[PDB]
Every structure is written in C-alpha cells, then in structure tokens.
C-alpha cells in the first residue's frame with residue numbers, strides 16, 4: 001500500500017566516512033503477515049565502452065551493506081506506521097565520483113525489501129548522492 005525509503009536528511013549529500021541513516025515506512029490497507037523487512041545499500045562504479053563490436057563493462061564496488069531491520073514474524077495492521085530504522089558508514093577514501101573522472105558513472109542507492117510467506121518480495125528504491133571527500 002505504501003513502501004518508502006526516507007533518509008534523516010531529505011536534502012543531504014554525503015561524503016567519505018559519513019553515516020547514512022533513515023527510516024523504512026510501511027502501510028497496509030488489509031491485515032498482513034509480513035515475514036521481514038530488509039535493506040541492501042550499494043556503491044557501484046560502472047564504466048562501459050566499445051572495442052570494435054565488443055561491449056565491455058568494468059565495475060567497482062565501493063559500498064555494499066546488507067541489513068535485516070527490526071521495530072520473529074509480524075502482523076501488520078492498517079492505520080499505523082511500521083517504521084524500520086537503518087544506518088551504515090560509507091567507506092573512507094574515494095567513493096567513485098571521478099572513477100576515471102567524467103565518463104565513469106557512480107551509482108549509489110538504498111533498496112528496501114518486503115517479504116511475506118507465499119508472496120513475491122516487493123521492492124522500492126531511493127537514490128542518494130555522495131561527494132568525494134578526496
């Protein structure tokens with residue numbers, strides 16, 4: 001019914017070593033037996049190019065955090081905000097912006113997972129920027 005990520009600062013951009021924290025906010029219309037809510041956070045640097053007829057792709061993992069949040073099976077009900085809290089630290093040193101500069105893309109985000117027994121996990125995704133503290 002409603003499944004957002006929301007960071008403590010809605011307008012913040014983060015640098016190296018800083019801690020991204022926020023909430024996961026859920027709303028059900030019907031009554032729901034949720035298995036669990038989770039989170040994957042990723043800092044990936046892609047760069048893609050041609051090479052004759054080849055397409056090459058070269059990746060870099062700067063960030064990769066997985067958490068199961070809390071508030072071990074839950075009865076969600078309508079008219080409440082089931083809020084789940086999460087937080088981690090981006091690495092020290094480079095965070096991607098300037099992988100090999102310009103043409104090298106950085107890609108930061110938080111995904112929220114919702115699991116229910118018999119039910120295909122739902123997702124929701126929110127981007128966030130980082131600045132190189134470099």
Ligand SMILES: [Ca+2]
Pocket residue numbers: 067068069070
């Ligand atoms: Ca946990």
